[PDB]
Amino acid sequence: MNIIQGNLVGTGLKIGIVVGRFNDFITSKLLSGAEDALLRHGVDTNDIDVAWVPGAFEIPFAAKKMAETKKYDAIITLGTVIRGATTHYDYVCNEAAKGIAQAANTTGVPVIFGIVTTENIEQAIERAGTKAGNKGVDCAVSAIEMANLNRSFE
Amino acid sequence: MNIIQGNLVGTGLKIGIVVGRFNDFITSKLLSGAEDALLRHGVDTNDIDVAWVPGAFEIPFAAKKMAETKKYDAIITLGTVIRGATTHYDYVCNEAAKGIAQAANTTGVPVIFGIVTTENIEQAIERAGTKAGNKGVDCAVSAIEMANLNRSFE
Amino acid sequence: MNIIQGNLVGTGLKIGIVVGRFNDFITSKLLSGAEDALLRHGVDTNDIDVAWVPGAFEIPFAAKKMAETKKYDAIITLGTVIRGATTHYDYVCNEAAKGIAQAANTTGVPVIFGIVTTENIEQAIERAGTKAGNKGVDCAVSAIEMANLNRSFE
Amino acid sequence: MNIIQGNLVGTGLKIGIVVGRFNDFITSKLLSGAEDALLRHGVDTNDIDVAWVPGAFEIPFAAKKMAETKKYDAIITLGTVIRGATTHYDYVCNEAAKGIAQAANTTGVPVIFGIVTTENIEQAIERAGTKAGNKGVDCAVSAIEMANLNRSFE
Amino acid sequence: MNIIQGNLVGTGLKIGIVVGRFNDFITSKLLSGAEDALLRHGVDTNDIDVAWVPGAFEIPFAAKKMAETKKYDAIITLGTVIRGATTHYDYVCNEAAKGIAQAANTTGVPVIFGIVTTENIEQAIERAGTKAGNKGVDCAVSAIEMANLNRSFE
Amino acid sequence: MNIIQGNLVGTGLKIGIVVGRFNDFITSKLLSGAEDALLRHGVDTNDIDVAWVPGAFEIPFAAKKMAETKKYDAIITLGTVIRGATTHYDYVCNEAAKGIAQAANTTGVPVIFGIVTTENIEQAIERAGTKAGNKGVDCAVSAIEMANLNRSFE
Amino acid sequence: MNIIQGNLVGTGLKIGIVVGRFNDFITSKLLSGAEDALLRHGVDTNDIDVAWVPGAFEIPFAAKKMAETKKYDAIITLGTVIRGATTHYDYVCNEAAKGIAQAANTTGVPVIFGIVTTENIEQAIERAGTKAGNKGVDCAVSAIEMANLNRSFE
Ligand SMILES: O=c1[nH]c(NC[C@H](O)[C@H](O)[C@H](O)CO)c([N+](=O)[O-])c(=O)[nH]1
Ligand SMILES: O=c1[nH]c(NC[C@H](O)[C@H](O)[C@H](O)CO)c([N+](=O)[O-])c(=O)[nH]1
């Protein structure tokens, strides 16, 4: 059986991140986590670009555009969608995942999915550097892995 | 880390809006909000075009068509879908988001999602200039931002 | 602000309708409504073509095919899906909207969505010429509007 | 108003069927129903081809492949997905309808949807030759109709 | 009626597997099951390649890339998504099935769906070599079948 | 074992129908269904005769009389009896089936039983072109079958 | 540690099956499953013999007799015992397993145990090609395995 795997050394990678302004109480902490984890895995802070957008509906648009430049080894997406009174949540979540998925697919560039989607605020706090760790961290890790594996893919 | 961001000055942008006739009790107020916010950010009223359609199922059709002219820096979509007795709601909401998403994607022109989707009338009133502000306003703001950011995208 | 709008005069339009045989108790009344409203807005009965299909799963297939002839200014779709015991309903509803949406999109020809989707029979009767009016009527009206607006679109 | 309709005479049609092995307790009875109805409408048993697949996830793959040969006037799809403990059901149902829909659409060849999707076994028995008739039968009928109508479509 | 069927002899097939790291408590056992079943059906262990990814969101990306090499007769996908507190689960499950489906479709290479999606841990244990058998096993079997059938498809 | 079966081609058959005026809200839709299904199976509209009677008590009288002319290959009976306050229903239903049965028996001409007998109006709507299909349709189908089989009977 | 294992290639095996007539609603489907799985693993249909018996009490008798011919590499036993009002069930189940066990033991020929024993009919349907797969299938698989392993046993 032949195993193909990306390892975790970030040295020399170039990474784009798209971050939503909506719920930026949470999303800035996700960006912090991601920043940190990348640098401590060896990415140069000079090699990270960060595009801010209004909210998660816009993430796929900025993601595909950044991917299609060919400047980046992997793209990180970061957002938080917390349930409200109505179903609007869902349409957003749904479109967001679907487009992120499409952006990797059309582009051949790894696009990591970091949209924390929850029922309430304490839940979002759990995944932004508390009890359940930090999704921005795990995302940064998966991005390095995917950038390394995709080199086996040309 | 290099931050890429669109700022909020609307001076010299050209904006298309597609507005649904269905629930126009609400949707005209969303259009008012949007109009106002654009002008006070510096868009010229002569630079705004507005296409009315029957309802939200039609918004993606008019949106892609307006986008594909290449006349506009960003497109604003405005609609209200309030839950009734049956599931029809959902099919509409769903198709509407999906097409709006597709229209930006195929065209490279920012298309903002302004469809207020709710369980009842008082909810729709909350997001049309009452308690929860005015979705048409927030939309106008996001459109300016996206038009400015996308200039970093060529 | 420049308003673009289709008006309601049907004089000289050519219209295709696709109607599902399933629940034709209801769907023939929707077709009647549509027929009437078109003629009284000035469409010539000689200018209306009607394709019958087995059920709503087939509507998108006949719709795209009729659209792609280029004979018609707008297409009307008519169907009724009433909930049963299982989830089958949903898959049908879902696929049906999605394909109808796609058919307009690929073709550039307006395709109106007239599928009444309900929980029970009395509900379907409400939207087929009773309490809630007649969906076939409203559809005919939206088709005229879209045919007129799309002339602003070339 | 000009009516376009496919009639029910199967004489001289060539039909492909894709049948899922999963829940073949039910799915073989659906295939029996379909076989019978086709022959008694005049299709030659020599003109029917049947591709077996592992389950409903695979139906769209075999369907598009059979359609794209251009040998068949219409394709029949047959499957049964019965709810279990988890949500897996849904993902299967969903993907299955979507692909079947896509296969007709890309190919221009009618693909009938015959996937019985239920909450329990007695429900699946109701639609496989009991109380609610036989879905394989109704499917065979719709396939003949669509093959005949699509001749109006070239 | 002419039956087309893939038989179960794996002799001489070449198989790619993509396995998610997330919930690898379960997913390594699925990989074990798959390995075993392939070898005992006659696939050479030298003819199996295995790509590890961060989680199920990434499976479609690695799957399409492996498929598009043209080295493999069929691709096996393996993952486990267990429900948590929020809706995140669903977005993952959904995107994952959809992309896997797309990967077969664009590529013409069979891609088997082996993502175990559950409400709790004991459920995932049931489908990883306990009470409900081993999904990795059933997957390996379906992959051989599809590789054999698709030879009837060229 | 030698199978004797009537097939479904209506070409060249001559069919008589007896329809009850009572509950003609429903019974005209049954007649529509029957008309349609016959023509699309190849019966010539010139070859169908339709006798209207006051209600189901009279159906057997008109049925035997039409049968005894020897003009028709099969007779279709259509009626609806909905439960009221008293037992009258039953006497009607009972006499009606019994006479229809007798009419085939004395005459040697197939007489199909199409009397929808129900507890309420929504039930009758279910069997007249809604949820449970259309009894007039199924009847037309059985009539063709019986006309074909009875040719094996001389 | 030295692993001894039978692989799954049925090519050239000769298999006897004993099937109970009792509950043959279920037991014929088990036989179908078994037939199929054997052929698709490469057993020649000419190399399968099938002995029908009255019920499960008789299975051990026919099994030992077939085993003792020395014609077969493995024997498959198939039966269904569904609980009734009294304890009779148990005596049958018990004797049946015990004898099947004895038959392998005295003979040195693998005898697979395929008696589905349940509390009700829906349970038996679950294990005959529905929700829980098909016991006749799993049995056929185990028989091939045991026939292959026992060659390590001389
Ligand atoms: O990132 C988010 N975007 C949200 N804004 C909606 C949307 O993403 C767009 O910014 C705008 O709707 C038009 O594109 C959200 N809510 O609405 O609640 C949310 O929770 N999270
Ligand atoms: O914009 C809306 N359109 C609606 N109309 C349906 C649809 O958008 C189309 O106008 C027409 O159905 C065919 O295209 C809605 N409802 O039906 O309730 C609604 O709530 N909101």
Ligand SMILES: O=c1[nH]c(NC[C@H](O)[C@H](O)[C@H](O)CO)c([N+](=O)[O-])c(=O)[nH]1
């Ligand atoms: O138009 C409808 N089609 C239906 N038939 C299913 C389907 O549309 C197809 O005709 C056939 O399934 C294969 O294409 C429906 N139900 O099944 O209930 C329904 O309610 N409405």
Ligand SMILES: O=c1[nH]c(NC[C@H](O)[C@H](O)[C@H](O)CO)c([N+](=O)[O-])c(=O)[nH]1
């Ligand atoms: O046809 C079905 N396929 C099923 N198998 C899943 C799937 O269709 C594939 O065969 C395999 O998962 C990978 O392609 C089902 N269940 O899982 O329950 C089901 O109910 N019905």
Ligand SMILES: O=c1[nH]c(NC[C@H](O)[C@H](O)[C@H](O)CO)c([N+](=O)[O-])c(=O)[nH]1
């Ligand atoms: O394979 C899984 N991936 C999961 N991780 C999410 C995702 O698949 C990605 O690895 C990452 O989110 C960005 O691509 C899951 N959860 O989050 O729970 C899970 O249950 N299973």
Ligand SMILES: O=c1[nH]c(NC[C@H](O)[C@H](O)[C@H](O)CO)c([N+](=O)[O-])c(=O)[nH]1
């Ligand atoms: O066909 C029907 N005939 C009915 N009329 C009774 C009868 O069939 C005769 O027309 C008349 O009674 C004398 O022959 C019914 N009811 O009375 O309710 C009925 O429900 N349906």
Ligand SMILES: O=c1[nH]c(NC[C@H](O)[C@H](O)[C@H](O)CO)c([N+](=O)[O-])c(=O)[nH]1
């Ligand atoms: O195979 C079965 N045999 C049964 N018949 C009993 C028995 O196996 C013999 O055929 C006969 O009793 C004398 O040998 C069963 N029941 O009695 O219910 C049963 O459930 N299943």
